[PDB]
Amino acid sequence: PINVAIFGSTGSIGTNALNIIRECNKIENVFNVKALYVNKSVNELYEQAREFLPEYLCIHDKSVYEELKELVKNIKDYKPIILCGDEGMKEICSSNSIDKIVIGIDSFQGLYSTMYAIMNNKIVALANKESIVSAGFFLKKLLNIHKNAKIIPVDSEHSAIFQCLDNNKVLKTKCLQDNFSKINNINKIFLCSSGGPFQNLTMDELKNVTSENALKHPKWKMGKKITIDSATMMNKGLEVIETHFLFDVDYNDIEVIVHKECIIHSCVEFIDKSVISQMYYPDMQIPILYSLTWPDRIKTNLKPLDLAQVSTLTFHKPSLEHFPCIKLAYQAGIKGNFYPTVLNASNEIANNLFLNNKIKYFDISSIISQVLESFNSQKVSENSEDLMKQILQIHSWAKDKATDIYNKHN
Template sequence: MKNISILGSTGSIGTQTLDVVRNNKEKFNVVGLSANNNIDLLEQQIKEFKPEAVAVMNEKKALELKKRIGNSKTNVFHGIDGLVTIATLENADLIVTSVVGMIGLIPTIKAIQCKKNIALANKETLVTAGEIVMKEAKKNGISILPVDSEHSAIFQCMMGYTLKDIERIILTASGGPFRGFNKDQLKNVTATEALKHPKWNMGKKISIDSATLMNKGLEVIEAKWLFDLDINKIEVVIHPQSIIHSMLEYKDSSIIAQMGYPDMRIPIQFALTYPDRIINNYKKLDLLEISSLTFEKPDLNTFPCLKLAYEALRVGGSLPTVLNAANEELVELFIQGKIGFYDIPKTIEFILEKHDVEYKLDIDKIIDIDKWTRNFVKNILL
């Protein structure tokens, strides 16, 4: 029986993680859950899984939840301290970090320092502080297991091999809802249109990132730190069918691909059960049904966010933190209908050019730069 805590249990990855647990009750025990403010769903999860502790970011919502569950043995915490509590529960064996955004950084670091293995779905943690996080993981002897389908695919393709065997990794991207659009077509697209992903069921922020291709850019940065690879060995191809989740080319010119029906529960399950594989009842891949797999080069002119992510990674230092923070703020403004689709890459590029890059970074410095960036976005757009 493996005890798990889930940060972000009411989101897309969190609910699918609980579905994996639900199908394998003899293997997993939920000891901690956290939510932003969806206490209705969190209350249901408490009744079903009976965790010892939960956290809600909003203090008023936390107090309301506490009243609702009454004499329940589940302790309720709130705020970032509450999130850290869930990430560091003494009897937790594995922490699933599926919160969206920079908020996942501190709880993840604290969990690592408490020697908790991490099933990582919060890509912003590595985008903003990859070097620090991976050093802490090595120092504390813990594993960081990727949950994203692309990074899980690379992780699986690497099993049994070392860095010296690898020529490059190839991250696949569906192309999102606007694949094939030109700039004129994209000028007036809405958030509602951007949220209609053709293959994956994801949260709002990630869906918008997929539409701009920023999601793939963040994954490039994440892959650099997860797998200790040079940027020149990380490529992206558009693969509309989303069947090959990523590929690995070895020095002998062999390419190994991990394939499967687009269902996030599959990589989630592998992260939870690693190094074992267990049976499930998820849809099996039928190659005859798929019939063909196609690939395209990313259009960096029409979708500049991917190019901006590569540039931020090449410069390094604090620039990926700025990229991430600016993107988070701009995506939220786009969802609210306050800015247009192309305001996202245009503003990110402007802020990257204005930022004086710093290279001597610690967590406090990264948090300060994150705050600076968010304030910058608000000052120039609101």
């Protein structure tokens, strides 16, 4: 019986997590949903509580706390512990009844909850790539202290890589640890990308693309921020750094490859040169489920992959001239220090400016480049609390710098 908490239970990751839990539990009772946590979606939380009957309920916005307490009286034979805010989140993380926590929260409230799950030696199913990019060294330090805590990757490509590894080796180590790649005999990673909507466009066409071109009738329905990052390939740039931190793979041994069918989710080359890959239809339920069943697998009723129907799988190298965000991500990763923090923060600003029609496509990369060029390496604090404060300071500095560059140009 797997006891699971879901943080951000009404977002995309949270609802896909509950969907696969529901469907798997029909086949065999495997999961007990112990806690649900949302920002302010009190009615959606009530609907989930009605079905899943968790021991804990938490809502971040305290203005809707009483509104939740009244609604929950409608559910029969049910007396949950209803909590509020950061203190509620912390009480859930500290509960002995919870084994695994799904983090479906974007940005730094995601990092904050991840931190407390780790301090409580839980398994943390983590989808938030920006938290790993911006606080990777901090998370490594925290995981070295809290020896039974584990991050299990949910980002589709990183789940794929993790699924391609031998658990007889994985169990000797854990993600976001030094020497992970040595212990697992990993030589190199093929990190698969959809390529986004702009692969066939010329440099002159890219000059004029808008956020509407990136968002309009998309091949893959996703959130706006990640859709823009897919269009610039900065999504893959961030995922290169995510790969480096999760699996301790050198940047020279991570290759971005454009695979437009999105059936192969990534591939691992081992030291003998044998390559293992993971494949499925594009569907977050498989990566989410594996994060909750690892090191085992369980039965689902998902549609089986029909390779004959798929028929063709294609691969090509991305053009760094057309997708300069990729090069910027490698440069930041290789420089190390807090350059990944700076990359992520400046991209947060540049992405949103492009989304709102304030800058052009190549201005995204120009702004990010200028902020990276302005940053000077800082001595990394040995003290965990000071290190988190450095990450926050540098994140804020980089956002401000990106905004200042935009303001001067405008």
